[model samples]
Target: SDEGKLFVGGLSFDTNEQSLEQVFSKYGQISEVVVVKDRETQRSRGFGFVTFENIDDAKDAMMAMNGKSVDGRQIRVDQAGKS
Candidate 1:
């Protein structure tokens, strides 16, 4: 089932949505990019979600980006779990 969503964790606190899109756009067409933020402090939670247009692209991104370093942190990328 091509959910087309990816979970990205261990992100640097300074990472933003634009930078995330820039890094992932090379893998495929991104439908959405979300950087989780704290409600009170409005700070990054060090994780985010990236939705691709298709499953193939999502898988490609997972394989290529998992454990890859970004913004001075080694990020973990994986397919988002179904709701």
Candidate 2:
């Protein structure tokens, strides 16, 4: 992912884009939300990305849920640029 993107760690496969879309929208307008899923199982790949309208929102979103638990696991958030 690139600018305005946040990496979500410890994701629950029970989640999907809309799940994160709402949560991230609480912080600011979102550009996109994706729960990285495997084609074989159509399940989460253990992580996701929530892209905000800008880096400012991205920073706040990352702070908003950095150590919070969502559904089945405690999640960690960071600026996304894994590649």
Candidate 3:
């Protein structure tokens, strides 16, 4: 099945994968949620990828979450890969 992957950006430095997954889970079943970390510093990079089991779920999440504030920061969501 085609994966519904989303690019999540402008995240807070404190956000973690678990919480990110929990938040997006409200929109649909998530396949995976990754909070990018700096390999050297082991710190959050303020960006990540979220994959949903269903395409519509990803779309719905983007619609509902894009520009929403979390951890006092507004984030941007978009379909991943093909710029």
Q: lDDT winner among the candidates?
A: 1
Count clashing pairs, candidate 1. Answer: 0
Error of 1 at 62 (Å): 0.2
Candidate 2 global lDDT:
0.85
Residue lDDT tens for model 2, 1-83: 57699999898868778778877799888878888888997867989988888788898888789999888788999988767
Error of 2 at 39 (Å): 2.5
lDDT of each: 0.92, 0.85, 0.89
Angstrom error of the Cα, residue 78, model 2: value is 0.6
Q: Model 1, 1-83: lDDT tens per residue? A: 34799999999989999989999999999999999999999898899999999789999999999999998899999888764
After the best TM-score superposition of candidate 1, give how far the Cα of residue 15 lies from its true spot, in angstroms. 0.4
lDDT of 3 by residue, 1-83 (tens): 23499999999888889878988999989988888888999888899999999899999999999999989999999888763
TM-score for all models, in order of appearance: 0.92, 0.88, 0.89
Name the runs in model 1 displaced over 4 angstroms: none
As for candidate 2, its clashing pairs are: none
Model 1: lDDT of residue 56: 90
